[PDB]
Protein backbone atom coordinates (compact mmCIF):
# COMPACT_ATOMS: atom_id res chain seq x y z
CA UNK A 1 0.00 0.00 0.00
CA UNK A 2 3.01 2.69 0.82
CA UNK A 3 4.30 2.06 -2.50
CA UNK A 4 1.13 2.55 -3.95
CA UNK A 5 1.00 5.37 -2.65
CA UNK A 6 4.30 6.84 -3.44
CA UNK A 7 4.31 6.38 -6.65
CA UNK A 8 0.79 7.57 -7.22
CA UNK A 9 2.07 11.05 -5.26
CA UNK A 10 4.83 11.06 -7.43
CA UNK A 11 2.74 11.05 -10.28
CA UNK A 12 0.52 13.47 -9.20
CA UNK A 13 2.89 15.82 -8.41
CA UNK A 14 4.44 15.39 -11.71
CA UNK A 15 0.42 16.42 -13.15
CA UNK A 16 0.94 19.62 -11.05
CA UNK A 17 4.19 20.62 -12.68
CA UNK A 18 2.19 20.43 -15.98
CA UNK A 19 -0.63 22.27 -14.84
CA UNK A 20 1.89 25.00 -13.54
CA UNK A 21 3.16 25.01 -17.12
CA UNK A 22 -0.07 25.85 -18.40
CA UNK A 23 -0.44 28.58 -16.01
CA UNK A 24 2.57 30.02 -17.09
CA UNK A 25 1.38 29.94 -20.69
CA UNK A 26 -2.09 31.22 -20.00
CA UNK A 27 0.03 33.91 -17.86
CA UNK A 28 1.86 35.11 -20.24
CA UNK A 29 -0.75 35.01 -23.24
CA UNK A 30 -2.70 37.47 -21.25
CA UNK A 31 0.30 39.41 -20.24
CA UNK A 32 0.50 40.01 -24.06
CA UNK A 33 -3.12 40.83 -24.34
CA UNK A 34 -2.71 43.54 -21.90
CA UNK A 35 0.37 45.82 -23.12
CA UNK A 36 -2.19 45.77 -26.29
CA UNK A 37 -4.93 46.89 -25.13
CA UNK A 38 -2.83 49.61 -22.81
CA UNK A 39 -1.46 50.38 -26.30
CA UNK A 40 -4.82 50.80 -27.61
CA UNK A 41 -6.24 53.07 -24.25
CA UNK A 42 -3.35 55.69 -24.60
CA UNK A 43 -4.33 55.84 -28.58
CA UNK A 44 -8.03 56.39 -27.62
CA UNK A 45 -6.56 59.23 -25.02
CA UNK A 46 -4.58 60.96 -28.01
CA UNK A 47 -7.14 60.89 -30.27
CA UNK A 48 -9.95 61.90 -28.15
CA UNK A 49 -9.16 65.67 -28.41
CA UNK A 50 -11.21 67.52 -30.73
CA UNK A 51 -7.93 69.43 -32.56
CA UNK A 52 -7.36 66.61 -34.87
CA UNK A 53 -8.54 66.68 -38.50
CA UNK A 54 -10.04 63.78 -40.19
CA UNK A 55 -7.55 62.19 -41.73
CA UNK A 56 -5.62 62.01 -38.29
CA UNK A 57 -8.68 60.13 -37.10
CA UNK A 58 -8.79 57.71 -39.87
CA UNK A 59 -5.12 57.11 -39.42
CA UNK A 60 -5.92 56.55 -35.63
CA UNK A 61 -8.94 54.31 -36.44
CA UNK A 62 -7.36 51.61 -38.44
CA UNK A 63 -4.29 51.38 -35.99
CA UNK A 64 -6.76 50.71 -33.42
CA UNK A 65 -8.06 48.20 -35.59
CA UNK A 66 -5.57 46.60 -36.52
CA UNK A 67 -4.09 46.28 -33.06
CA UNK A 68 -8.21 44.75 -31.70
CA UNK A 69 -7.40 42.29 -35.14
CA UNK A 70 -4.20 41.33 -33.58
CA UNK A 71 -5.82 40.87 -29.98
CA UNK A 72 -8.31 38.39 -31.61
CA UNK A 73 -5.10 36.70 -33.39
CA UNK A 74 -3.63 35.72 -30.62
CA UNK A 75 -6.35 35.04 -28.46
CA UNK A 76 -7.42 32.68 -31.68
CA UNK A 77 -3.62 30.33 -32.33
CA UNK A 78 -2.43 30.93 -28.44
CA UNK A 79 -2.58 26.97 -27.55
CA UNK A 80 -0.62 24.16 -25.43
CA UNK A 81 -0.42 20.79 -26.66
CA UNK A 82 -3.65 20.28 -29.09
CA UNK A 83 -5.57 22.89 -25.94
CA UNK A 84 -6.73 26.20 -26.83
CA UNK A 85 -7.01 27.68 -23.50
CA UNK A 86 -8.41 31.20 -24.25
CA UNK A 87 -10.79 29.72 -27.13
CA UNK A 88 -13.86 29.02 -24.20
CA UNK A 89 -15.35 29.71 -20.68
CA UNK A 90 -14.14 26.27 -19.97
CA UNK A 91 -13.06 24.24 -16.09
CA UNK A 92 -9.54 22.59 -16.30
CA UNK A 93 -9.01 19.50 -13.92
CA UNK A 94 -5.60 18.59 -12.84
CA UNK A 95 -5.01 15.50 -10.76
CA UNK A 96 -3.32 16.24 -7.30
CA UNK A 97 -4.14 13.76 -4.88
CA UNK A 98 -3.16 9.83 -4.86
CA UNK A 99 -7.39 8.77 -4.47
CA UNK A 100 -9.71 9.74 -6.75
CA UNK A 101 -11.43 13.39 -6.52
CA UNK A 102 -8.31 14.89 -5.29
CA UNK A 103 -8.14 17.68 -8.23
CA UNK A 104 -7.45 21.46 -8.59
CA UNK A 105 -9.99 23.32 -10.99
CA UNK A 106 -8.44 26.15 -12.96
CA UNK A 107 -11.13 28.76 -14.36
CA UNK A 108 -10.19 29.57 -18.18
CA UNK A 109 -12.52 32.62 -19.60
CA UNK A 110 -12.89 33.14 -23.65
CA UNK A 111 -11.20 36.39 -24.40
CA UNK A 112 -11.59 38.14 -27.77
CA UNK A 113 -12.90 41.25 -28.86
CA UNK A 114 -16.49 40.49 -28.98
CA UNK A 115 -16.21 39.15 -25.21
CA UNK A 116 -14.02 41.85 -23.76
CA UNK A 117 -16.81 44.17 -25.73
CA UNK A 118 -17.54 47.22 -27.81
CA UNK A 119 -17.55 44.73 -30.87
CA UNK A 120 -15.39 47.33 -32.99
CA UNK A 121 -14.30 50.79 -31.14
CA UNK A 122 -15.55 53.13 -33.64
CA UNK A 123 -13.71 56.40 -32.90
CA UNK A 124 -13.77 57.52 -36.48
CA UNK A 125 -17.45 57.99 -36.02
CA UNK A 126 -19.08 61.65 -37.06
CA UNK A 127 -18.94 63.15 -34.06
CA UNK A 128 -21.15 65.53 -32.19
CA UNK A 129 -22.85 68.12 -34.55
CA UNK A 130 -25.25 71.25 -33.72
CA UNK A 131 -28.92 70.81 -35.20
CA UNK A 132 -30.72 73.04 -37.07
CA UNK A 133 -33.24 76.01 -36.10
CA UNK A 134 -36.81 75.85 -35.75
CA UNK A 135 -37.26 76.49 -39.21
CA UNK A 136 -40.91 77.55 -38.58
CA UNK A 137 -41.62 77.08 -42.84
CA UNK A 138 -41.11 73.30 -42.92
CA UNK A 139 -43.72 72.72 -39.83
CA UNK A 140 -47.03 72.36 -42.23
CA UNK A 141 -49.33 70.92 -39.45
CA UNK A 142 -53.01 71.70 -38.29
CA UNK A 143 -53.56 75.79 -37.82
CA UNK A 144 -55.35 76.45 -34.68
CA UNK A 145 -55.44 80.47 -33.69
CA UNK A 146 -57.40 79.56 -30.46
CA UNK A 147 -54.04 80.74 -27.95
CA UNK A 148 -55.38 79.23 -24.32
CA UNK A 149 -52.76 81.50 -23.35
CA UNK A 150 -54.60 84.77 -24.40
CA UNK A 151 -51.94 86.44 -25.93
CA UNK A 152 -52.11 87.87 -29.91
CA UNK A 153 -48.91 86.95 -31.09
CA UNK A 154 -48.72 83.63 -30.55
CA UNK A 155 -50.29 80.53 -32.68
CA UNK A 156 -50.95 77.02 -32.22
CA UNK A 157 -49.39 74.38 -34.30
CA UNK A 158 -51.02 70.61 -34.16
CA UNK A 159 -49.44 67.84 -36.39
CA UNK A 160 -52.45 65.94 -37.42
CA UNK A 161 -52.61 62.79 -39.39
CA UNK A 162 -51.12 61.02 -36.24
CA UNK A 163 -53.75 58.40 -35.70
CA UNK A 164 -52.86 55.41 -34.24
CA UNK A 165 -53.85 52.43 -35.96
CA UNK A 166 -55.16 49.51 -34.09
CA UNK A 167 -52.31 47.02 -34.29
CA UNK A 168 -50.56 50.67 -32.30
CA UNK A 169 -53.07 50.01 -29.94
CA UNK A 170 -52.65 46.42 -29.32
CA UNK A 171 -48.89 47.14 -29.05
CA UNK A 172 -49.08 49.50 -26.63
CA UNK A 173 -51.50 47.69 -24.34
CA UNK A 174 -49.18 44.51 -24.60
CA UNK A 175 -45.78 46.48 -23.94
CA UNK A 176 -46.85 47.57 -20.27
CA UNK A 177 -48.27 44.91 -17.43
CA UNK A 178 -51.21 44.25 -15.67
CA UNK A 179 -53.59 46.67 -18.17
CA UNK A 180 -57.37 45.93 -18.67
CA UNK A 181 -58.70 45.67 -22.40
CA UNK A 182 -62.53 44.70 -22.64
CA UNK A 183 -63.53 43.44 -26.19
CA UNK A 184 -66.29 41.26 -27.53
CA UNK A 185 -66.94 38.86 -30.65
CA UNK A 186 -63.69 37.23 -29.51
CA UNK A 187 -62.19 34.10 -31.80
CA UNK A 188 -62.66 31.24 -29.98
CA UNK A 189 -63.88 31.85 -26.67
CA UNK A 190 -66.45 34.60 -26.91
CA UNK A 191 -67.56 34.17 -30.62
CA UNK A 192 -71.35 33.90 -29.37
CA UNK A 193 -71.13 37.25 -27.85
CA UNK A 194 -73.48 35.82 -24.99
CA UNK A 195 -71.34 38.02 -22.41
CA UNK A 196 -69.41 41.26 -23.36
CA UNK A 197 -67.88 42.08 -20.01
CA UNK A 198 -63.92 39.91 -20.08
CA UNK A 199 -62.06 42.74 -19.24
CA UNK A 200 -59.26 39.39 -20.28
CA UNK A 201 -57.62 40.20 -16.58
CA UNK A 202 -53.66 40.66 -17.93
CA UNK A 203 -51.64 39.32 -15.25
CA UNK A 204 -48.36 39.02 -15.98
CA UNK A 205 -48.27 37.37 -19.55
CA UNK A 206 -50.55 36.32 -22.78
CA UNK A 207 -54.03 37.49 -22.35
CA UNK A 208 -56.28 35.66 -19.70
CA UNK A 209 -60.06 35.77 -19.82
CA UNK A 210 -63.28 34.90 -17.79
CA UNK A 211 -66.26 34.02 -19.15
CA UNK A 212 -69.65 32.18 -18.36
CA UNK A 213 -71.70 29.62 -20.26
CA UNK A 214 -70.83 29.96 -23.78
CA UNK A 215 -68.17 27.73 -24.80
CA UNK A 216 -70.92 24.43 -24.90
CA UNK A 217 -69.81 23.29 -28.66
CA UNK A 218 -66.88 25.11 -28.71
CA UNK A 219 -64.28 23.47 -27.41
CA UNK A 220 -63.62 21.60 -30.80
CA UNK A 221 -62.94 24.98 -32.45
CA UNK A 222 -60.98 26.61 -29.37
CA UNK A 223 -58.36 23.73 -27.99
CA UNK A 224 -57.96 22.56 -31.48
CA UNK A 225 -57.32 25.42 -34.10
CA UNK A 226 -55.79 23.42 -36.68
CA UNK A 227 -57.64 20.43 -39.02
CA UNK A 228 -55.60 17.64 -36.48
CA UNK A 229 -54.65 19.02 -33.45
CA UNK A 230 -55.16 17.29 -30.05
CA UNK A 231 -54.43 18.32 -26.25
CA UNK A 232 -54.17 16.27 -23.12
CA UNK A 233 -56.41 17.56 -20.66
CA UNK A 234 -57.32 16.26 -17.13
CA UNK A 235 -61.04 15.20 -16.04
CA UNK A 236 -62.22 14.53 -12.33
CA UNK A 237 -65.69 14.01 -11.21
CA UNK A 238 -64.87 15.42 -7.47
CA UNK A 239 -61.91 13.94 -5.35
CA UNK A 240 -60.66 11.37 -8.19
CA UNK A 241 -58.44 12.83 -10.96
CA UNK A 242 -57.99 11.04 -14.25
CA UNK A 243 -56.15 12.12 -17.28
CA UNK A 244 -57.64 12.09 -20.75
CA UNK A 245 -57.21 13.49 -24.03
CA UNK A 246 -59.91 15.32 -26.29
CA UNK A 247 -60.05 15.74 -30.21
CA UNK A 248 -62.07 17.77 -32.13
CA UNK A 249 -65.18 17.08 -29.60
CA UNK A 250 -65.26 13.38 -30.30
CA UNK A 251 -63.88 10.34 -28.61
CA UNK A 252 -62.47 11.12 -25.11
CA UNK A 253 -59.35 8.82 -25.85
CA UNK A 254 -57.80 8.30 -22.74
CA UNK A 255 -53.62 9.68 -21.89
CA UNK A 256 -52.51 6.14 -22.08
CA UNK A 257 -50.75 4.41 -25.55
CA UNK A 258 -54.00 3.61 -27.40
CA UNK A 259 -56.61 3.63 -24.34
CA UNK A 260 -60.07 4.57 -25.32
CA UNK A 261 -62.41 5.98 -22.82
CA UNK A 262 -66.12 5.24 -23.70
CA UNK A 263 -69.12 7.22 -21.32
CA UNK A 264 -71.10 5.00 -19.13
CA UNK A 265 -72.82 5.39 -15.52
CA UNK A 266 -76.03 6.91 -16.38
CA UNK A 267 -77.14 8.62 -13.03
CA UNK A 268 -73.29 9.30 -12.42
CA UNK A 269 -71.68 9.75 -15.99
CA UNK A 270 -67.92 8.14 -15.27
CA UNK A 271 -65.57 7.13 -17.62
CA UNK A 272 -64.26 3.90 -18.12
CA UNK A 273 -61.76 2.22 -20.91
CA UNK A 274 -63.95 -1.04 -20.52
CA UNK A 275 -67.59 0.78 -20.25
CA UNK A 276 -70.53 -0.92 -21.16
CA UNK A 277 -72.48 1.79 -22.88
CA UNK A 278 -72.87 4.03 -25.69
CA UNK A 279 -69.87 6.27 -27.36
CA UNK A 280 -68.13 9.16 -25.32
CA UNK A 281 -68.29 12.66 -26.72
CA UNK A 282 -67.26 16.23 -25.42
CA UNK A 283 -71.03 17.05 -26.25
CA UNK A 284 -72.61 14.45 -23.68
CA UNK A 285 -69.71 14.60 -21.34
CA UNK A 286 -70.59 18.28 -20.91
CA UNK A 287 -74.39 17.52 -19.62
CA UNK A 288 -72.83 15.08 -17.61
CA UNK A 289 -70.10 17.61 -15.80
CA UNK A 290 -73.03 19.72 -15.32
CA UNK A 291 -75.37 17.61 -13.85
CA UNK A 292 -72.45 15.50 -11.56
CA UNK A 293 -70.94 19.36 -10.85
CA UNK A 294 -67.69 18.33 -12.10
CA UNK A 295 -64.29 19.53 -13.81
CA UNK A 296 -62.71 19.29 -17.06
CA UNK A 297 -59.43 21.69 -16.17
CA UNK A 298 -56.35 21.72 -18.46
CA UNK A 299 -53.14 23.43 -18.15
CA UNK A 300 -54.43 26.04 -20.63
CA UNK A 301 -57.95 27.09 -19.16
CA UNK A 302 -59.72 25.56 -15.69
CA UNK A 303 -63.61 24.44 -17.28
CA UNK A 304 -66.60 23.05 -15.67
CA UNK A 305 -69.81 23.14 -16.52
CA UNK A 306 -73.35 23.55 -15.14
CA UNK A 307 -76.31 22.24 -16.98
CA UNK A 308 -75.21 21.42 -20.89
CA UNK A 309 -72.62 24.20 -21.13
CA UNK A 310 -69.27 25.08 -19.93
CA UNK A 311 -68.48 27.46 -17.74
CA UNK A 312 -64.43 29.06 -18.67
CA UNK A 313 -62.48 30.25 -15.69
CA UNK A 314 -58.60 30.35 -15.92
CA UNK A 315 -58.45 30.90 -20.20
CA UNK A 316 -55.41 32.22 -21.62
CA UNK A 317 -55.77 32.70 -24.94
CA UNK A 318 -51.77 33.76 -27.17
CA UNK A 319 -51.59 37.23 -26.99
CA UNK A 320 -50.71 37.53 -30.85
CA UNK A 321 -53.84 35.84 -31.98
CA UNK A 322 -56.13 37.93 -29.69
CA UNK A 323 -54.32 41.09 -31.31
CA UNK A 324 -54.90 39.54 -34.80
CA UNK A 325 -58.68 38.75 -33.48
CA UNK A 326 -59.60 42.38 -32.01
CA UNK A 327 -57.81 44.10 -35.11
CA UNK A 328 -61.61 44.85 -36.97
CA UNK A 329 -63.77 44.87 -34.27
CA UNK A 330 -64.81 47.15 -31.24
CA UNK A 331 -63.27 47.61 -27.88
CA UNK A 332 -62.50 49.91 -25.31
CA UNK A 333 -58.86 48.71 -24.08
CA UNK A 334 -57.23 51.03 -21.50
CA UNK A 335 -53.81 51.44 -20.58
CA UNK A 336 -52.35 53.03 -17.26
CA UNK A 337 -54.88 55.65 -16.05
CA UNK A 338 -56.08 55.91 -19.46
CA UNK A 339 -58.98 54.88 -21.57
CA UNK A 340 -59.42 54.35 -25.07
CA UNK A 341 -61.86 53.64 -27.41
CA UNK A 342 -62.28 51.76 -30.42
CA UNK A 343 -65.16 51.00 -32.48
CA UNK A 344 -65.05 49.18 -35.88
CA UNK A 345 -62.16 51.11 -36.94
CA UNK A 346 -59.29 52.86 -34.78
CA UNK A 347 -59.49 55.92 -32.81
CA UNK A 348 -63.07 55.77 -33.23
CA UNK A 349 -63.33 58.54 -30.69
CA UNK A 350 -60.85 60.46 -32.45
CA UNK A 351 -58.51 60.92 -29.56
CA UNK A 352 -55.79 58.52 -29.94
CA UNK A 353 -52.44 60.05 -31.12
CA UNK A 354 -49.24 58.94 -31.40
CA UNK A 355 -46.31 60.68 -29.83
CA UNK A 356 -42.54 60.33 -30.48
CA UNK A 357 -42.72 56.47 -29.41
CA UNK A 358 -45.73 56.56 -27.10
CA UNK A 359 -49.51 56.29 -27.20
CA UNK A 360 -50.85 59.60 -25.71
CA UNK A 361 -54.51 60.90 -26.05
CA UNK A 362 -53.46 64.15 -27.27
CA UNK A 363 -51.76 65.51 -30.32
CA UNK A 364 -47.84 67.26 -30.45
CA UNK A 365 -49.08 70.95 -29.62
CA UNK A 366 -46.36 73.06 -30.97
CA UNK A 367 -46.86 77.23 -30.32
CA UNK A 368 -45.36 80.04 -33.53
CA UNK A 369 -43.57 82.95 -31.92
CA UNK A 370 -43.54 86.42 -32.48
CA UNK A 371 -40.02 86.30 -33.38
CA UNK A 372 -40.73 82.98 -35.58
CA UNK A 373 -39.41 80.34 -33.21
CA UNK A 374 -41.08 77.25 -32.17
CA UNK A 375 -41.74 76.38 -28.70
CA UNK A 376 -43.52 73.84 -26.34
CA UNK A 377 -44.76 76.20 -23.82
CA UNK A 378 -46.42 79.39 -24.68
CA UNK A 379 -44.40 81.39 -21.73
CA UNK A 380 -41.24 82.28 -23.38
CA UNK A 381 -39.34 81.84 -20.07
CA UNK A 382 -39.91 78.05 -20.81
CA UNK A 383 -40.07 75.94 -23.67
CA UNK A 384 -36.82 74.27 -24.82
CA UNK A 385 -37.33 75.67 -28.02
CA UNK A 386 -37.69 72.93 -30.83
CA UNK A 387 -35.00 72.00 -33.55
CA UNK A 388 -34.73 69.94 -36.70
CA UNK A 389 -32.01 68.17 -38.46
CA UNK A 390 -31.28 64.24 -39.47
CA UNK A 391 -34.49 62.63 -38.12
CA UNK A 392 -37.15 65.00 -38.37
CA UNK A 393 -40.05 64.44 -35.97
CA UNK A 394 -38.93 68.33 -34.89
CA UNK A 395 -37.10 66.76 -31.67
CA UNK A 396 -36.23 68.83 -29.11
CA UNK A 397 -32.67 68.40 -28.70
CA UNK A 398 -29.59 70.39 -29.42
CA UNK A 399 -27.51 67.22 -30.20
CA UNK A 400 -27.79 63.85 -32.70
CA UNK A 401 -26.59 61.16 -31.70
CA UNK A 402 -23.28 60.35 -32.69
CA UNK A 403 -22.12 56.72 -34.04
CA UNK A 404 -18.75 56.88 -32.46
CA UNK A 405 -18.50 55.02 -28.69
CA UNK A 406 -20.35 56.67 -25.60
CA UNK A 407 -17.67 56.04 -23.27
CA UNK A 408 -14.41 54.93 -24.32
CA UNK A 409 -12.43 55.20 -21.71
CA UNK A 410 -14.84 53.80 -18.87
CA UNK A 411 -15.07 50.94 -21.52
CA UNK A 412 -11.17 50.17 -21.69
CA UNK A 413 -11.39 49.93 -17.87
CA UNK A 414 -13.45 47.86 -17.43
CA UNK A 415 -12.22 45.25 -19.82
CA UNK A 416 -8.19 46.23 -18.65
CA UNK A 417 -10.09 45.21 -15.09
CA UNK A 418 -11.56 42.06 -16.39
CA UNK A 419 -8.02 41.15 -18.29
CA UNK A 420 -6.02 42.20 -14.70
CA UNK A 421 -8.97 39.96 -12.73
CA UNK A 422 -7.95 37.11 -14.86
CA UNK A 423 -4.11 37.62 -14.27
CA UNK A 424 -4.72 37.62 -10.90
CA UNK A 425 -7.23 34.54 -10.97
CA UNK A 426 -4.07 32.90 -13.08
CA UNK A 427 -1.33 33.57 -10.26
CA UNK A 428 -3.31 32.81 -7.63
CA UNK A 429 -3.95 29.37 -9.43
CA UNK A 430 0.11 28.67 -9.94
CA UNK A 431 0.75 29.74 -5.99
CA UNK A 432 -1.53 27.48 -4.79
CA UNK A 433 -0.40 24.88 -7.37
CA UNK A 434 3.37 25.54 -5.90
CA UNK A 435 2.12 25.04 -2.85
CA UNK A 436 0.75 21.57 -3.50
CA UNK A 437 3.80 20.57 -5.16
CA UNK A 438 6.13 21.07 -2.19
CA UNK A 439 3.45 19.60 0.33
CA UNK A 440 3.29 16.50 -2.12
CA UNK A 441 6.83 16.26 -1.81
CA UNK A 442 7.50 16.58 1.40
CA UNK A 443 4.39 13.71 2.20
CA UNK A 444 5.64 11.19 -0.50
CA UNK A 445 9.10 11.54 1.35
CA UNK A 446 8.29 10.86 4.59
CA UNK A 447 5.65 8.35 3.91
CA UNK B 1 -58.39 -9.02 -3.36
CA UNK B 2 -58.45 -5.53 -1.54
CA UNK B 3 -57.95 -2.38 -3.88
CA UNK B 4 -58.08 -3.09 -7.49
CA UNK B 5 -54.95 -0.13 -7.95
CA UNK B 6 -54.78 0.63 -11.73
CA UNK B 7 -51.74 0.04 -13.26
CA UNK B 8 -50.62 3.26 -13.60
CA UNK B 9 -47.86 4.45 -11.06
CA UNK B 10 -49.93 5.39 -8.43
CA UNK B 11 -53.67 5.74 -9.49
CA UNK B 12 -56.47 3.97 -7.98
CA UNK B 13 -59.66 2.60 -9.19
CA UNK B 14 -62.93 3.28 -8.43
CA UNK B 15 -66.18 1.09 -9.40
CA UNK B 16 -69.35 3.24 -10.45
CA UNK B 17 -71.82 2.86 -13.50
CA UNK B 18 -74.87 1.04 -11.39
CA UNK B 19 -76.17 -1.68 -13.90
CA UNK B 20 -72.74 -1.07 -16.03
CA UNK B 21 -70.78 -1.75 -12.91
CA UNK B 22 -67.28 0.06 -14.86
CA UNK B 23 -64.05 0.93 -13.39
CA UNK B 24 -63.08 4.62 -12.90
CA UNK B 25 -60.03 6.81 -11.86
CA UNK B 26 -63.07 9.73 -11.60
CA UNK B 27 -65.45 7.63 -9.78
CA UNK B 28 -68.37 8.86 -7.98
CA UNK B 29 -69.26 5.91 -5.48
CA UNK B 30 -68.10 3.89 -3.08
CA UNK B 31 -64.43 1.86 -2.53
CA UNK B 32 -63.72 -0.67 -5.36
CA UNK B 33 -63.09 -4.35 -4.11
CA UNK B 34 -62.73 -7.88 -6.02
CA UNK B 35 -65.78 -9.25 -3.85
CA UNK B 36 -68.12 -7.16 -6.05
CA UNK B 37 -66.86 -7.08 -9.19
CA UNK B 38 -66.53 -10.43 -8.80
CA UNK B 39 -70.22 -10.69 -8.90
CA UNK B 40 -70.68 -7.45 -11.40
CA UNK B 41 -68.68 -9.23 -14.07
CA UNK B 42 -70.59 -12.19 -13.55
CA UNK B 43 -73.75 -9.89 -14.13
CA UNK B 44 -72.45 -8.35 -17.06
CA UNK B 45 -70.90 -11.58 -18.40
CA UNK B 46 -67.16 -9.79 -19.04
CA UNK B 47 -63.39 -11.26 -18.55
CA UNK B 48 -60.68 -10.27 -15.56
CA UNK B 49 -57.99 -12.67 -17.92
CA UNK B 50 -54.24 -12.19 -16.66
CA UNK C 1 -4.33 18.01 -19.23
CA UNK C 2 -3.92 15.15 -21.54
CA UNK C 3 -4.99 15.30 -25.20
CA UNK C 4 -6.89 12.24 -26.75
CA UNK C 5 -3.79 10.84 -28.06
CA UNK C 6 -2.05 10.28 -24.85
CA UNK C 7 -5.43 8.93 -23.47
CA UNK C 8 -5.07 6.37 -26.90
CA UNK C 9 -1.35 5.44 -25.85
CA UNK C 10 -2.03 5.09 -22.46
CA UNK C 11 -5.09 2.76 -22.99
CA UNK C 12 -3.48 0.67 -25.68
CA UNK C 13 -0.61 0.41 -23.11
CA UNK C 14 -3.20 -1.03 -20.42
CA UNK C 15 -4.86 -3.23 -22.10
CA UNK C 16 -1.66 -4.76 -23.48
CA UNK C 17 -0.77 -5.04 -19.47
CA UNK C 18 -4.25 -6.10 -18.55
CA UNK C 19 -3.80 -8.99 -21.61
CA UNK C 20 -0.47 -10.11 -19.94
CA UNK C 21 -2.15 -10.41 -16.70
CA UNK C 22 -5.01 -13.13 -18.44
CA UNK C 23 -1.79 -14.98 -20.28
CA UNK C 24 -0.01 -15.16 -16.71
CA UNK C 25 -3.29 -16.57 -15.33
CA UNK C 26 -3.74 -19.18 -18.08
CA UNK C 27 -0.03 -19.95 -18.43
CA UNK C 28 1.08 -20.73 -14.83
CA UNK C 29 1.44 -24.60 -14.02
CA UNK C 30 2.59 -26.71 -11.65
CA UNK C 31 2.89 -30.52 -12.82
CA UNK C 32 -0.58 -30.95 -15.14
CA UNK C 33 -2.52 -28.21 -12.62
CA UNK C 34 -3.19 -24.96 -13.57
CA UNK C 35 -3.68 -23.11 -9.83
CA UNK C 36 -5.24 -20.32 -10.88
CA UNK C 37 -7.21 -21.84 -13.37
CA UNK C 38 -10.00 -22.57 -10.62
CA UNK C 39 -11.78 -21.70 -7.46
CA UNK C 40 -10.69 -25.33 -6.44
CA UNK C 41 -8.92 -26.84 -3.27
CA UNK C 42 -6.14 -28.76 -2.69
CA UNK C 43 -5.58 -31.90 -0.41
CA UNK C 44 -1.80 -32.46 1.18
CA UNK C 45 -1.64 -35.68 3.21
CA UNK C 46 0.48 -35.12 6.34
CA UNK C 47 -0.44 -37.75 8.54
CA UNK C 48 0.07 -41.59 8.75
CA UNK C 49 -3.32 -42.88 8.91
CA UNK D 1 -12.60 29.93 -62.80
CA UNK D 2 -9.70 28.32 -61.27
CA UNK D 3 -6.91 26.09 -61.89
CA UNK D 4 -5.78 22.71 -59.57
CA UNK D 5 -3.01 23.44 -57.17
CA UNK D 6 -0.20 20.82 -57.19
CA UNK D 7 0.85 22.22 -53.76
CA UNK D 8 -0.55 20.53 -50.93
CA UNK D 9 -3.56 21.57 -49.63
CA UNK D 10 -2.92 21.18 -45.98
CA UNK D 11 0.76 19.97 -45.18
CA UNK D 12 1.04 20.75 -41.59
CA UNK D 13 -2.29 18.51 -40.57
CA UNK D 14 -1.21 15.85 -42.96
CA UNK D 15 2.54 15.78 -41.71
CA UNK D 16 1.30 16.22 -37.65
CA UNK D 17 -1.04 12.59 -38.42
CA UNK D 18 2.47 11.13 -39.74
CA UNK D 19 4.07 11.94 -36.64
CA UNK D 20 0.92 11.21 -34.49
CA UNK D 21 0.83 7.08 -36.38
CA UNK D 22 4.73 6.81 -35.84
CA UNK D 23 4.64 7.72 -31.93
CA UNK D 24 1.63 5.17 -32.35
CA UNK D 25 3.32 2.60 -33.48
CA UNK D 26 6.26 3.31 -30.94
CA UNK D 27 4.01 3.19 -28.43
CA UNK D 28 3.09 -0.23 -28.95
CA UNK D 29 7.17 -1.23 -29.06
CA UNK D 30 6.72 0.52 -25.89
CA UNK D 31 4.40 -2.01 -24.41
CA UNK D 32 5.35 -5.02 -26.21
CA UNK D 33 8.68 -4.39 -24.42
CA UNK D 34 7.19 -3.94 -21.19
CA UNK D 35 5.23 -7.19 -21.05
CA UNK D 36 7.99 -8.92 -22.46
CA UNK D 37 10.17 -8.28 -19.79
CA UNK D 38 7.38 -8.70 -17.20
CA UNK D 39 6.99 -12.42 -18.73
CA UNK D 40 10.87 -12.97 -18.45
CA UNK D 41 10.88 -11.90 -14.73
CA UNK D 42 8.28 -14.11 -14.36
CA UNK D 43 9.81 -17.15 -16.07
CA UNK D 44 13.04 -16.74 -14.42
CA UNK D 45 11.10 -16.62 -10.79
CA UNK D 46 9.31 -19.94 -12.01
CA UNK D 47 12.29 -21.72 -13.35
CA UNK D 48 14.23 -21.28 -9.96
CA UNK D 49 11.34 -22.26 -7.96
CA UNK D 50 10.98 -25.60 -10.31
Redesign the interface.
Request: aromatic share 4%.
Given at each position: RFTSNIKGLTQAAR?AN??IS?AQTTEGALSEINNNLQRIRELTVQASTGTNSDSDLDSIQDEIKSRLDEIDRVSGQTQF???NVLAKDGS?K?QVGANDGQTITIDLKKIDSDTLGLNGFNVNGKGETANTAATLKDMSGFTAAAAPGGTVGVTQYTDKSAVASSVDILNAVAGADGNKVTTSADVGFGTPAAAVTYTYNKDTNSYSAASDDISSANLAAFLNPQARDTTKAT????G????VNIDKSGNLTAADDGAVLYM??????????????TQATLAKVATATGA?A?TIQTDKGTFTSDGTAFDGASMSIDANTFANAVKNDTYTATVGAKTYSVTTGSAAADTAYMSNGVLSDTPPTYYAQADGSITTTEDAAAGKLVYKGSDGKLTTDTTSKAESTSDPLAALDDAISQIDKFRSSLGAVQNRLDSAVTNLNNTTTNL
Amino acid sequence: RFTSNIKGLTQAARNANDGISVAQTTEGALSEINNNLQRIRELTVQASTGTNSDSDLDSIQDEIKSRLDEIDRVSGQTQFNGVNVLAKDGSMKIQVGANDGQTITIDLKKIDSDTLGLNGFNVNGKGETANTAATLKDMSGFTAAAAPGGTVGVTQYTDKSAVASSVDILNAVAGADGNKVTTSADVGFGTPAAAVTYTYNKDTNSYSAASDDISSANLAAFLNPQARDTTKATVTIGGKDQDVNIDKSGNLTAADDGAVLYMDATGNLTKNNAGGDTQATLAKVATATGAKAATIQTDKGTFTSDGTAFDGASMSIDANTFANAVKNDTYTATVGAKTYSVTTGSAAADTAYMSNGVLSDTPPTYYAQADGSITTTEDAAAGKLVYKGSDGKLTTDTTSKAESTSDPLAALDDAISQIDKFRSSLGAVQNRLDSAVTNLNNTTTNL
